[PDB]
Design a protein around this ligand. Structure first.
Ligand SMILES: [Cl-]
Ligand SMILES: [Cl-]
Ligand SMILES: [Cl-]
Ligand SMILES: [Zn+2]
Ligand SMILES: [Zn+2]
Ligand SMILES: [Zn+2]
Ligand SMILES: [Zn+2]
Length: 110
């Protein structure tokens, strides 16, 4: 489905703003997101994924703590190691540049 779908994957107050802030960043770097990402067949909630990876401490920390399977489970995109590997790939492709830019202070945090 369309990326707009990510607005209804949750009820959080800050979802809409984070999403538009995120989509604006992707457009800015030349990689606009038009379709809602997915892990296999299941829809991927990029907002919740971003927030929880941030809770854990970022990509390197999720790797170190081997939390990809737990996150995939929490996001309902599979419980297998295959689902976990795919989720890590999607995080890298859709969110790591954003994590990196924000951490470096170039992009103010959402
Ligand atoms: Cl921006
Ligand atoms: Cl949360
Ligand atoms: Cl929380
Ligand atoms: Zn907006
Ligand atoms: Zn920007
Ligand atoms: Zn969390
Ligand atoms: Zn949380």
């Amino acid at each position: 489905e369309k990326i707009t779908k990510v607005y209804e994957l949750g009820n959080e107050p800050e979802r809409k703003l984070w999403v538009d802030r995120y989509l604006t960043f992707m457009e800015e770097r030349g990689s606009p997101v038009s379709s809602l990402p997915a892990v296999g067949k299941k829809p991927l909630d990029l907002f919740r994924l971003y927030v929880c990876v941030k809770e854990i401490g970022g990509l390197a920390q999720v790797n170190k703590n081997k939390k990809w399977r737990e996150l995939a489970t929490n996001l309902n995109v599979g419980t297998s190691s295959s689902a976990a590997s795919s989720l890590k790939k999607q995080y890298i492709q859709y969110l790591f540049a954003f994590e990196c830019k924000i951490e470096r202070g170039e992009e103010p945090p959402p």
